[PDB]
Amino acid sequence: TNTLQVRLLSENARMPERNHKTDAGYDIFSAETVVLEPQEKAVIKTDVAVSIPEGYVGLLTSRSGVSSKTHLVIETGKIDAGYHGNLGINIKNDAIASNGYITPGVFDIKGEIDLSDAIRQYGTYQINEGDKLAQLVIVPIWTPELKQVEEFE
Amino acid sequence: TNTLQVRLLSENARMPERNHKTDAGYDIFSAETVVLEPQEKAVIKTDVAVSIPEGYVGLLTSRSGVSSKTHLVIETGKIDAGYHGNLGINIKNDAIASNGYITPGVFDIKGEIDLSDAIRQYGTYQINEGDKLAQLVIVPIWTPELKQVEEFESV
Ligand SMILES: [Mg+2]
Ligand SMILES: [Mg+2]
């Protein structure tokens, strides 16, 4: 009744982490390395599956630090009870490219710069395997039957 | 007497270096840090002075690794016997600036790129204090009197 079943799908998967018992969510890790130039979109794999129980929905959503200090935008995933596949994080680099502004650096998930292997548009990001990118929050839901009516009351 | 006198003019000066007794030249080192955007020129100080003996000229000239893997072009200076001031390396960055393209990256003397403090044109080099930039080759010379003639004639 108070345990969530988890599957690790590969040697690159990491068990979800929680600091205190009272915290709202579990931190979720990237299982892959992905380069996002400005305005690029992707669904980044975690190699983790969970079993959300009947009567709830899982929310796969952003973190404060990452969203306020970078241009990486995560669209909140609604995880159905019974979805048992690989969790994916829905992301966009919403930076806008500037003309001829180029660099051998890439931004990381902390907003810091490191030297990379290529010349790219300034504002490109690199997500690394192991990056603490998103978090999982789980909340109760109402799932009623629908009744069509002509007037409410 | 087969010795060349050398003066070190500062704490940034490096004594010239040679590998092999048979090598043509002595490698020469930059005493300063210089940024050159495309088409930019400078004379770069070494803080070294030498006394070339009478009957010779010193040739301050490029190295194959530097000139073939970068756009840094060195014009061979001719050092007179009796020039005793600071030796300078006469250099141009002969990369061409490409439209916009700006960057925080700068290239070094090995052709590699690192990250810099400012935004500049793509193609900018940065030379560092201690870079092994040039060599010195010393050759003998003929310095005759001139005679004007109406027609040339056999010696
Ligand atoms: Mg936008
Ligand atoms: Mg030219």
PDB file of C-alpha atoms and ligand atoms in Angstrom:
ATOM      1  CA  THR A   1       0.000   0.000   0.000  1.00  0.00           C
ATOM      2  CA  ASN A   2       2.920   2.305   0.558  1.00  0.00           C
ATOM      3  CA  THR A   3       5.587   0.958  -1.747  1.00  0.00           C
ATOM      4  CA  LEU A   4       6.216   1.934  -5.372  1.00  0.00           C
ATOM      5  CA  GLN A   5       7.580  -0.899  -7.668  1.00  0.00           C
ATOM      6  CA  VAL A   6      10.498   0.165  -9.903  1.00  0.00           C
ATOM      7  CA  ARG A   7      12.357  -1.562 -12.784  1.00  0.00           C
ATOM      8  CA  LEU A   8      15.921  -0.742 -13.839  1.00  0.00           C
ATOM      9  CA  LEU A   9      16.098  -1.309 -17.578  1.00  0.00           C
ATOM     10  CA  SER A  10      19.883  -1.084 -18.069  1.00  0.00           C
ATOM     11  CA  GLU A  11      23.291  -0.644 -16.469  1.00  0.00           C
ATOM     12  CA  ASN A  12      22.881   3.070 -17.287  1.00  0.00           C
ATOM     13  CA  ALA A  13      19.741   3.384 -15.128  1.00  0.00           C
ATOM     14  CA  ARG A  14      19.851   4.954 -11.684  1.00  0.00           C
ATOM     15  CA  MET A  15      17.410   4.354  -8.824  1.00  0.00           C
ATOM     16  CA  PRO A  16      15.303   7.514  -8.170  1.00  0.00           C
ATOM     17  CA  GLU A  17      16.476   9.619  -5.190  1.00  0.00           C
ATOM     18  CA  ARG A  18      14.798  11.448  -2.297  1.00  0.00           C
ATOM     19  CA  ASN A  19      16.444  13.681   0.289  1.00  0.00           C
ATOM     20  CA  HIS A  20      13.801  13.797   3.056  1.00  0.00           C
ATOM     21  CA  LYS A  21      10.723  11.710   3.634  1.00  0.00           C
ATOM     22  CA  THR A  22       8.558  14.854   3.448  1.00  0.00           C
ATOM     23  CA  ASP A  23       9.808  16.026   0.023  1.00  0.00           C
ATOM     24  CA  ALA A  24       7.241  16.160  -2.787  1.00  0.00           C
ATOM     25  CA  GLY A  25       9.136  14.210  -5.454  1.00  0.00           C
ATOM     26  CA  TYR A  26      11.871  11.751  -6.441  1.00  0.00           C
ATOM     27  CA  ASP A  27      14.765  13.059  -8.536  1.00  0.00           C
ATOM     28  CA  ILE A  28      15.098  11.268 -11.902  1.00  0.00           C
ATOM     29  CA  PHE A  29      18.297  10.729 -13.927  1.00  0.00           C
ATOM     30  CA  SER A  30      19.212  10.826 -17.647  1.00  0.00           C
ATOM     31  CA  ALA A  31      20.429   7.475 -18.961  1.00  0.00           C
ATOM     32  CA  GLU A  32      21.929   9.030 -22.107  1.00  0.00           C
ATOM     33  CA  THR A  33      24.071  11.786 -23.607  1.00  0.00           C
ATOM     34  CA  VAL A  34      22.286  14.221 -25.894  1.00  0.00           C
ATOM     35  CA  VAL A  35      23.360  17.468 -27.595  1.00  0.00           C
ATOM     36  CA  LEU A  36      20.606  20.094 -28.106  1.00  0.00           C
ATOM     37  CA  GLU A  37      21.286  23.049 -30.355  1.00  0.00           C
ATOM     38  CA  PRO A  38      18.931  26.072 -30.000  1.00  0.00           C
ATOM     39  CA  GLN A  39      15.255  25.186 -30.696  1.00  0.00           C
ATOM     40  CA  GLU A  40      15.953  21.430 -30.786  1.00  0.00           C
ATOM     41  CA  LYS A  41      13.466  18.985 -29.183  1.00  0.00           C
ATOM     42  CA  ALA A  42      13.859  15.434 -27.829  1.00  0.00           C
ATOM     43  CA  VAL A  43      12.472  12.803 -25.493  1.00  0.00           C
ATOM     44  CA  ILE A  44      15.341  11.719 -23.253  1.00  0.00           C
ATOM     45  CA  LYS A  45      15.266   8.173 -21.928  1.00  0.00           C
ATOM     46  CA  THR A  46      15.726   7.256 -18.260  1.00  0.00           C
ATOM     47  CA  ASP A  47      15.806   3.445 -18.553  1.00  0.00           C
ATOM     48  CA  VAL A  48      13.441   3.338 -15.588  1.00  0.00           C
ATOM     49  CA  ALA A  49       9.903   1.937 -15.462  1.00  0.00           C
ATOM     50  CA  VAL A  50       7.448   2.302 -12.593  1.00  0.00           C
ATOM     51  CA  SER A  51       4.033   0.915 -11.709  1.00  0.00           C
ATOM     52  CA  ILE A  52       1.772   3.863 -10.690  1.00  0.00           C
ATOM     53  CA  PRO A  53      -1.130   2.325  -8.786  1.00  0.00           C
ATOM     54  CA  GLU A  54      -4.844   2.665  -9.726  1.00  0.00           C
ATOM     55  CA  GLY A  55      -6.307   5.956  -8.470  1.00  0.00           C
ATOM     56  CA  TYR A  56      -3.186   8.089  -9.108  1.00  0.00           C
ATOM     57  CA  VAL A  57      -1.216   9.786 -11.906  1.00  0.00           C
ATOM     58  CA  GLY A  58       2.592  10.275 -11.985  1.00  0.00           C
ATOM     59  CA  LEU A  59       3.884  13.757 -12.840  1.00  0.00           C
ATOM     60  CA  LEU A  60       7.259  13.873 -14.607  1.00  0.00           C
ATOM     61  CA  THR A  61       8.121  17.534 -14.208  1.00  0.00           C
ATOM     62  CA  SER A  62      10.883  20.180 -14.003  1.00  0.00           C
ATOM     63  CA  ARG A  63      13.303  21.196 -11.196  1.00  0.00           C
ATOM     64  CA  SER A  64      13.764  24.815 -10.006  1.00  0.00           C
ATOM     65  CA  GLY A  65      17.530  25.060 -10.396  1.00  0.00           C
ATOM     66  CA  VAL A  66      17.593  23.640 -13.931  1.00  0.00           C
ATOM     67  CA  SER A  67      14.585  25.569 -15.232  1.00  0.00           C
ATOM     68  CA  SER A  68      15.604  28.996 -13.831  1.00  0.00           C
ATOM     69  CA  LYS A  69      19.302  28.876 -14.782  1.00  0.00           C
ATOM     70  CA  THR A  70      19.043  27.276 -18.281  1.00  0.00           C
ATOM     71  CA  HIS A  71      16.891  27.491 -21.437  1.00  0.00           C
ATOM     72  CA  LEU A  72      15.948  23.790 -21.170  1.00  0.00           C
ATOM     73  CA  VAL A  73      12.150  23.533 -21.028  1.00  0.00           C
ATOM     74  CA  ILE A  74      10.432  20.357 -19.802  1.00  0.00           C
ATOM     75  CA  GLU A  75       6.797  19.689 -20.634  1.00  0.00           C
ATOM     76  CA  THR A  76       5.214  17.785 -17.727  1.00  0.00           C
ATOM     77  CA  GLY A  77       4.568  14.115 -18.550  1.00  0.00           C
ATOM     78  CA  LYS A  78       1.349  12.540 -17.294  1.00  0.00           C
ATOM     79  CA  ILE A  79       2.172   8.892 -16.450  1.00  0.00           C
ATOM     80  CA  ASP A  80      -0.919   6.597 -16.478  1.00  0.00           C
ATOM     81  CA  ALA A  81      -1.467   3.827 -13.948  1.00  0.00           C
ATOM     82  CA  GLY A  82      -0.441   0.725 -15.899  1.00  0.00           C
ATOM     83  CA  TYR A  83       2.190   2.361 -18.106  1.00  0.00           C
ATOM     84  CA  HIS A  84       5.151   0.031 -17.661  1.00  0.00           C
ATOM     85  CA  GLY A  85       7.533   1.275 -20.365  1.00  0.00           C
ATOM     86  CA  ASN A  86      10.750   3.311 -20.250  1.00  0.00           C
ATOM     87  CA  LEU A  87      10.127   6.787 -18.684  1.00  0.00           C
ATOM     88  CA  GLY A  88      10.903   9.628 -21.093  1.00  0.00           C
ATOM     89  CA  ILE A  89      11.560  13.321 -20.389  1.00  0.00           C
ATOM     90  CA  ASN A  90      10.002  15.718 -22.920  1.00  0.00           C
ATOM     91  CA  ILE A  91      12.402  18.600 -23.487  1.00  0.00           C
ATOM     92  CA  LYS A  92      13.191  21.628 -25.674  1.00  0.00           C
ATOM     93  CA  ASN A  93      16.198  23.966 -25.839  1.00  0.00           C
ATOM     94  CA  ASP A  94      14.179  27.161 -26.092  1.00  0.00           C
ATOM     95  CA  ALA A  95      17.199  29.403 -26.592  1.00  0.00           C
ATOM     96  CA  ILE A  96      17.163  31.315 -29.884  1.00  0.00           C
ATOM     97  CA  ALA A  97      20.238  31.152 -32.138  1.00  0.00           C
ATOM     98  CA  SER A  98      22.121  34.335 -32.848  1.00  0.00           C
ATOM     99  CA  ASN A  99      23.415  34.840 -36.423  1.00  0.00           C
ATOM    100  CA  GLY A 100      27.124  34.108 -36.513  1.00  0.00           C
ATOM    101  CA  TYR A 101      27.708  33.558 -32.815  1.00  0.00           C
ATOM    102  CA  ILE A 102      29.615  30.228 -32.568  1.00  0.00           C
ATOM    103  CA  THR A 103      31.788  28.389 -29.985  1.00  0.00           C
ATOM    104  CA  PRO A 104      33.697  25.166 -29.084  1.00  0.00           C
ATOM    105  CA  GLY A 105      31.999  25.273 -25.685  1.00  0.00           C
ATOM    106  CA  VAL A 106      28.667  23.772 -24.625  1.00  0.00           C
ATOM    107  CA  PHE A 107      26.421  24.756 -21.694  1.00  0.00           C
ATOM    108  CA  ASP A 108      25.743  22.053 -19.135  1.00  0.00           C
ATOM    109  CA  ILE A 109      22.658  21.471 -16.977  1.00  0.00           C
ATOM    110  CA  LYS A 110      24.091  23.850 -14.287  1.00  0.00           C
ATOM    111  CA  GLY A 111      24.553  26.682 -16.770  1.00  0.00           C
ATOM    112  CA  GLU A 112      28.334  26.188 -16.753  1.00  0.00           C
ATOM    113  CA  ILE A 113      30.529  26.039 -19.862  1.00  0.00           C
ATOM    114  CA  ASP A 114      32.925  23.275 -20.895  1.00  0.00           C
ATOM    115  CA  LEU A 115      35.039  22.674 -24.013  1.00  0.00           C
ATOM    116  CA  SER A 116      33.384  20.245 -26.480  1.00  0.00           C
ATOM    117  CA  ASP A 117      34.466  18.330 -29.637  1.00  0.00           C
ATOM    118  CA  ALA A 118      32.955  20.650 -32.300  1.00  0.00           C
ATOM    119  CA  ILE A 119      32.094  24.209 -33.361  1.00  0.00           C
ATOM    120  CA  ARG A 120      28.414  24.847 -32.597  1.00  0.00           C
ATOM    121  CA  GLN A 121      25.912  27.693 -32.343  1.00  0.00           C
ATOM    122  CA  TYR A 122      26.295  29.632 -29.088  1.00  0.00           C
ATOM    123  CA  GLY A 123      23.549  28.498 -26.689  1.00  0.00           C
ATOM    124  CA  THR A 124      23.834  24.770 -27.379  1.00  0.00           C
ATOM    125  CA  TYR A 125      23.440  22.429 -24.366  1.00  0.00           C
ATOM    126  CA  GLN A 126      24.777  19.004 -23.608  1.00  0.00           C
ATOM    127  CA  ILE A 127      22.880  16.632 -21.393  1.00  0.00           C
ATOM    128  CA  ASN A 128      25.126  14.004 -19.840  1.00  0.00           C
ATOM    129  CA  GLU A 129      24.331  10.466 -18.689  1.00  0.00           C
ATOM    130  CA  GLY A 130      23.719  10.715 -14.949  1.00  0.00           C
ATOM    131  CA  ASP A 131      22.297  14.275 -15.046  1.00  0.00           C
ATOM    132  CA  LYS A 132      19.627  15.007 -12.467  1.00  0.00           C
ATOM    133  CA  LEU A 133      17.182  16.517 -14.984  1.00  0.00           C
ATOM    134  CA  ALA A 134      13.591  15.982 -13.784  1.00  0.00           C
ATOM    135  CA  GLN A 135      11.556  14.756 -10.791  1.00  0.00           C
ATOM    136  CA  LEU A 136       8.603  12.399 -10.213  1.00  0.00           C
ATOM    137  CA  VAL A 137       5.597  13.700  -8.196  1.00  0.00           C
ATOM    138  CA  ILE A 138       2.613  11.377  -7.565  1.00  0.00           C
ATOM    139  CA  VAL A 139      -0.935  12.639  -6.816  1.00  0.00           C
ATOM    140  CA  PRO A 140      -4.477  11.108  -6.345  1.00  0.00           C
ATOM    141  CA  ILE A 141      -7.076  11.510  -9.106  1.00  0.00           C
ATOM    142  CA  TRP A 142     -10.826  11.504  -9.571  1.00  0.00           C
ATOM    143  CA  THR A 143     -12.000   9.280 -12.434  1.00  0.00           C
ATOM    144  CA  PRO A 144     -15.803   9.523 -12.651  1.00  0.00           C
ATOM    145  CA  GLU A 145     -18.320   8.334 -15.215  1.00  0.00           C
ATOM    146  CA  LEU A 146     -19.578  10.942 -17.652  1.00  0.00           C
ATOM    147  CA  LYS A 147     -23.269  11.937 -17.803  1.00  0.00           C
ATOM    148  CA  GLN A 148     -24.466  14.246 -20.572  1.00  0.00           C
ATOM    149  CA  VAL A 149     -27.034  16.767 -19.315  1.00  0.00           C
ATOM    150  CA  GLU A 150     -28.980  19.680 -20.832  1.00  0.00           C
ATOM    151  CA  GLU A 151     -28.579  21.893 -17.784  1.00  0.00           C
ATOM    152  CA  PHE A 152     -26.271  21.603 -14.796  1.00  0.00           C
ATOM    153  CA  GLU A 153     -27.467  21.422 -11.256  1.00  0.00           C
TER     154      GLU A 153
ATOM    155  CA  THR B   1      86.220  32.254 -31.211  1.00  0.00           C
ATOM    156  CA  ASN B   2      82.982  30.408 -31.893  1.00  0.00           C
ATOM    157  CA  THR B   3      80.830  31.888 -29.134  1.00  0.00           C
ATOM    158  CA  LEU B   4      77.788  34.145 -29.425  1.00  0.00           C
ATOM    159  CA  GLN B   5      77.147  36.708 -26.676  1.00  0.00           C
ATOM    160  CA  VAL B   6      73.569  36.929 -25.364  1.00  0.00           C
ATOM    161  CA  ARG B   7      71.801  39.450 -23.039  1.00  0.00           C
ATOM    162  CA  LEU B   8      68.696  38.578 -21.057  1.00  0.00           C
ATOM    163  CA  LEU B   9      66.791  41.839 -20.784  1.00  0.00           C
ATOM    164  CA  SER B  10      64.145  40.793 -18.208  1.00  0.00           C
ATOM    165  CA  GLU B  11      62.713  38.059 -16.035  1.00  0.00           C
ATOM    166  CA  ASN B  12      60.426  37.011 -18.899  1.00  0.00           C
ATOM    167  CA  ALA B  13      63.366  36.301 -21.177  1.00  0.00           C
ATOM    168  CA  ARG B  14      64.318  32.781 -22.079  1.00  0.00           C
ATOM    169  CA  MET B  15      67.771  31.706 -23.193  1.00  0.00           C
ATOM    170  CA  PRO B  16      67.576  30.465 -26.836  1.00  0.00           C
ATOM    171  CA  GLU B  17      67.569  26.638 -27.231  1.00  0.00           C
ATOM    172  CA  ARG B  18      69.191  24.041 -29.519  1.00  0.00           C
ATOM    173  CA  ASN B  19      68.677  20.239 -29.751  1.00  0.00           C
ATOM    174  CA  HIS B  20      71.587  19.089 -31.745  1.00  0.00           C
ATOM    175  CA  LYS B  21      74.966  20.619 -32.494  1.00  0.00           C
ATOM    176  CA  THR B  22      74.334  20.188 -36.231  1.00  0.00           C
ATOM    177  CA  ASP B  23      70.942  22.011 -36.267  1.00  0.00           C
ATOM    178  CA  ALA B  24      70.732  25.132 -38.416  1.00  0.00           C
ATOM    179  CA  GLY B  25      69.153  27.400 -35.784  1.00  0.00           C
ATOM    180  CA  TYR B  26      68.352  28.483 -32.222  1.00  0.00           C
ATOM    181  CA  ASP B  27      64.702  28.466 -31.150  1.00  0.00           C
ATOM    182  CA  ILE B  28      63.473  31.881 -29.947  1.00  0.00           C
ATOM    183  CA  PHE B  29      60.739  32.612 -27.346  1.00  0.00           C
ATOM    184  CA  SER B  30      58.026  35.249 -26.953  1.00  0.00           C
ATOM    185  CA  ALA B  31      58.352  37.368 -23.816  1.00  0.00           C
ATOM    186  CA  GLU B  32      54.729  38.580 -23.917  1.00  0.00           C
ATOM    187  CA  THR B  33      51.075  37.673 -24.378  1.00  0.00           C
ATOM    188  CA  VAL B  34      49.435  39.051 -27.545  1.00  0.00           C
ATOM    189  CA  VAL B  35      45.972  38.728 -29.090  1.00  0.00           C
ATOM    190  CA  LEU B  36      45.780  39.101 -32.888  1.00  0.00           C
ATOM    191  CA  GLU B  37      42.401  39.210 -34.576  1.00  0.00           C
ATOM    192  CA  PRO B  38      42.326  38.428 -38.322  1.00  0.00           C
ATOM    193  CA  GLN B  39      44.659  40.605 -40.474  1.00  0.00           C
ATOM    194  CA  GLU B  40      46.191  42.120 -37.350  1.00  0.00           C
ATOM    195  CA  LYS B  41      49.987  42.817 -37.225  1.00  0.00           C
ATOM    196  CA  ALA B  42      52.578  43.148 -34.437  1.00  0.00           C
ATOM    197  CA  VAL B  43      56.297  43.075 -33.645  1.00  0.00           C
ATOM    198  CA  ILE B  44      56.569  40.699 -30.645  1.00  0.00           C
ATOM    199  CA  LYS B  45      59.234  41.292 -28.007  1.00  0.00           C
ATOM    200  CA  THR B  46      61.593  38.498 -26.899  1.00  0.00           C
ATOM    201  CA  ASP B  47      63.583  40.478 -24.245  1.00  0.00           C
ATOM    202  CA  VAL B  48      66.754  39.000 -25.698  1.00  0.00           C
ATOM    203  CA  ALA B  49      69.732  40.732 -27.380  1.00  0.00           C
ATOM    204  CA  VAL B  50      72.677  39.266 -29.278  1.00  0.00           C
ATOM    205  CA  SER B  51      75.943  40.477 -30.739  1.00  0.00           C
ATOM    206  CA  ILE B  52      76.272  39.220 -34.306  1.00  0.00           C
ATOM    207  CA  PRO B  53      79.961  39.407 -35.295  1.00  0.00           C
ATOM    208  CA  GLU B  54      81.243  41.394 -38.312  1.00  0.00           C
ATOM    209  CA  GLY B  55      80.885  39.524 -41.626  1.00  0.00           C
ATOM    210  CA  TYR B  56      77.596  37.888 -40.690  1.00  0.00           C
ATOM    211  CA  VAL B  57      73.872  38.501 -40.701  1.00  0.00           C
ATOM    212  CA  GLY B  58      71.285  36.977 -38.329  1.00  0.00           C
ATOM    213  CA  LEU B  59      68.043  35.626 -39.800  1.00  0.00           C
ATOM    214  CA  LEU B  60      65.036  35.694 -37.502  1.00  0.00           C
ATOM    215  CA  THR B  61      62.618  33.362 -39.134  1.00  0.00           C
ATOM    216  CA  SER B  62      59.791  30.841 -38.889  1.00  0.00           C
ATOM    217  CA  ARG B  63      59.409  27.218 -37.780  1.00  0.00           C
ATOM    218  CA  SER B  64      57.653  24.558 -39.894  1.00  0.00           C
ATOM    219  CA  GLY B  65      55.106  23.408 -37.294  1.00  0.00           C
ATOM    220  CA  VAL B  66      53.939  26.944 -36.556  1.00  0.00           C
ATOM    221  CA  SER B  67      53.724  28.240 -40.129  1.00  0.00           C
ATOM    222  CA  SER B  68      52.073  25.151 -41.630  1.00  0.00           C
ATOM    223  CA  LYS B  69      49.440  24.559 -38.919  1.00  0.00           C
ATOM    224  CA  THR B  70      48.423  28.187 -38.199  1.00  0.00           C
ATOM    225  CA  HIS B  71      47.730  31.410 -40.139  1.00  0.00           C
ATOM    226  CA  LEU B  72      50.540  33.248 -38.271  1.00  0.00           C
ATOM    227  CA  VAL B  73      52.959  34.617 -40.861  1.00  0.00           C
ATOM    228  CA  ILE B  74      56.463  35.684 -39.900  1.00  0.00           C
ATOM    229  CA  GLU B  75      58.497  38.047 -42.093  1.00  0.00           C
ATOM    230  CA  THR B  76      62.220  37.141 -41.848  1.00  0.00           C
ATOM    231  CA  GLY B  77      64.108  39.940 -40.142  1.00  0.00           C
ATOM    232  CA  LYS B  78      67.699  40.625 -41.092  1.00  0.00           C
ATOM    233  CA  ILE B  79      69.755  41.377 -37.928  1.00  0.00           C
ATOM    234  CA  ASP B  80      72.813  43.591 -38.605  1.00  0.00           C
ATOM    235  CA  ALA B  81      76.156  43.071 -36.906  1.00  0.00           C
ATOM    236  CA  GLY B  82      76.110  45.601 -34.100  1.00  0.00           C
ATOM    237  CA  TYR B  83      72.351  45.780 -33.570  1.00  0.00           C
ATOM    238  CA  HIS B  84      72.208  45.369 -29.791  1.00  0.00           C
ATOM    239  CA  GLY B  85      68.588  46.145 -28.920  1.00  0.00           C
ATOM    240  CA  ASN B  86      65.648  43.899 -28.067  1.00  0.00           C
ATOM    241  CA  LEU B  87      64.989  41.253 -30.783  1.00  0.00           C
ATOM    242  CA  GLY B  88      61.479  41.469 -32.271  1.00  0.00           C
ATOM    243  CA  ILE B  89      59.449  38.957 -34.278  1.00  0.00           C
ATOM    244  CA  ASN B  90      57.559  40.516 -37.168  1.00  0.00           C
ATOM    245  CA  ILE B  91      54.158  38.831 -37.367  1.00  0.00           C
ATOM    246  CA  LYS B  92      50.767  38.938 -39.069  1.00  0.00           C
ATOM    247  CA  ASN B  93      47.675  36.836 -38.510  1.00  0.00           C
ATOM    248  CA  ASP B  94      46.749  36.252 -42.170  1.00  0.00           C
ATOM    249  CA  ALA B  95      43.391  34.592 -41.516  1.00  0.00           C
ATOM    250  CA  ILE B  96      40.493  36.469 -43.137  1.00  0.00           C
ATOM    251  CA  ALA B  97      37.463  37.471 -41.020  1.00  0.00           C
ATOM    252  CA  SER B  98      34.320  35.482 -42.068  1.00  0.00           C
ATOM    253  CA  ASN B  99      31.263  37.803 -42.296  1.00  0.00           C
ATOM    254  CA  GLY B 100      29.803  37.862 -38.845  1.00  0.00           C
ATOM    255  CA  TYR B 101      31.128  34.741 -37.057  1.00  0.00           C
ATOM    256  CA  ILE B 102      32.109  35.851 -33.611  1.00  0.00           C
ATOM    257  CA  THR B 103      33.332  33.632 -30.776  1.00  0.00           C
ATOM    258  CA  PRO B 104      34.823  33.495 -27.251  1.00  0.00           C
ATOM    259  CA  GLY B 105      37.352  30.975 -28.588  1.00  0.00           C
ATOM    260  CA  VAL B 106      40.963  31.777 -29.513  1.00  0.00           C
ATOM    261  CA  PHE B 107      43.455  29.617 -31.396  1.00  0.00           C
ATOM    262  CA  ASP B 108      46.929  28.942 -30.117  1.00  0.00           C
ATOM    263  CA  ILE B 109      50.330  28.429 -31.707  1.00  0.00           C
ATOM    264  CA  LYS B 110      49.596  24.693 -32.129  1.00  0.00           C
ATOM    265  CA  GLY B 111      46.408  25.260 -34.093  1.00  0.00           C
ATOM    266  CA  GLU B 112      44.166  24.344 -31.134  1.00  0.00           C
ATOM    267  CA  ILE B 113      41.218  26.285 -29.673  1.00  0.00           C
ATOM    268  CA  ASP B 114      40.440  27.157 -25.991  1.00  0.00           C
ATOM    269  CA  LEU B 115      37.965  29.538 -24.273  1.00  0.00           C
ATOM    270  CA  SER B 116      38.714  33.231 -23.756  1.00  0.00           C
ATOM    271  CA  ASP B 117      37.502  36.171 -21.663  1.00  0.00           C
ATOM    272  CA  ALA B 118      35.941  38.082 -24.540  1.00  0.00           C
ATOM    273  CA  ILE B 119      33.938  37.888 -27.748  1.00  0.00           C
ATOM    274  CA  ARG B 120      35.986  38.328 -30.930  1.00  0.00           C
ATOM    275  CA  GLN B 121      36.021  37.446 -34.633  1.00  0.00           C
ATOM    276  CA  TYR B 122      36.339  33.714 -35.367  1.00  0.00           C
ATOM    277  CA  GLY B 123      39.953  33.165 -36.426  1.00  0.00           C
ATOM    278  CA  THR B 124      41.701  35.129 -33.643  1.00  0.00           C
ATOM    279  CA  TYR B 125      45.013  33.843 -32.299  1.00  0.00           C
ATOM    280  CA  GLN B 126      46.447  34.369 -28.879  1.00  0.00           C
ATOM    281  CA  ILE B 127      50.228  34.168 -28.450  1.00  0.00           C
ATOM    282  CA  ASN B 128      51.440  33.403 -24.930  1.00  0.00           C
ATOM    283  CA  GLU B 129      54.539  34.415 -22.992  1.00  0.00           C
ATOM    284  CA  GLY B 130      56.929  31.475 -23.462  1.00  0.00           C
ATOM    285  CA  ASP B 131      55.627  30.368 -26.884  1.00  0.00           C
ATOM    286  CA  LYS B 132      58.329  28.904 -29.074  1.00  0.00           C
ATOM    287  CA  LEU B 133      57.616  31.233 -32.006  1.00  0.00           C
ATOM    288  CA  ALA B 134      60.735  31.629 -34.156  1.00  0.00           C
ATOM    289  CA  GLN B 135      64.338  30.675 -34.899  1.00  0.00           C
ATOM    290  CA  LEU B 136      67.635  32.432 -35.435  1.00  0.00           C
ATOM    291  CA  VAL B 137      69.926  31.332 -38.255  1.00  0.00           C
ATOM    292  CA  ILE B 138      73.285  33.051 -38.780  1.00  0.00           C
ATOM    293  CA  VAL B 139      74.969  33.073 -42.216  1.00  0.00           C
ATOM    294  CA  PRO B 140      78.198  34.723 -43.528  1.00  0.00           C
ATOM    295  CA  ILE B 141      77.982  37.696 -45.935  1.00  0.00           C
ATOM    296  CA  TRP B 142      79.902  39.467 -48.675  1.00  0.00           C
ATOM    297  CA  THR B 143      80.073  43.243 -48.202  1.00  0.00           C
ATOM    298  CA  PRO B 144      82.016  44.809 -51.144  1.00  0.00           C
ATOM    299  CA  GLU B 145      82.572  48.348 -52.328  1.00  0.00           C
ATOM    300  CA  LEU B 146      80.339  49.419 -55.197  1.00  0.00           C
ATOM    301  CA  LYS B 147      81.716  50.378 -58.598  1.00  0.00           C
ATOM    302  CA  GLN B 148      79.639  51.963 -61.330  1.00  0.00           C
ATOM    303  CA  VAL B 149      80.402  50.693 -64.865  1.00  0.00           C
ATOM    304  CA  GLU B 150      79.108  51.516 -68.369  1.00  0.00           C
ATOM    305  CA  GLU B 151      79.359  47.870 -69.377  1.00  0.00           C
ATOM    306  CA  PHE B 152      80.024  44.747 -67.266  1.00  0.00           C
ATOM    307  CA  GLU B 153      83.453  43.224 -67.496  1.00  0.00           C
ATOM    308  CA  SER B 154      85.351  40.092 -66.510  1.00  0.00           C
ATOM    309  CA  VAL B 155      86.741  39.709 -62.978  1.00  0.00           C
TER     310      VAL B 155
HETATM  311 MG    MG C   1      10.085  29.939 -27.351  1.00  0.00          MG
HETATM  312 MG    MG C   2      46.645  37.447 -47.100  1.00  0.00          MG
END
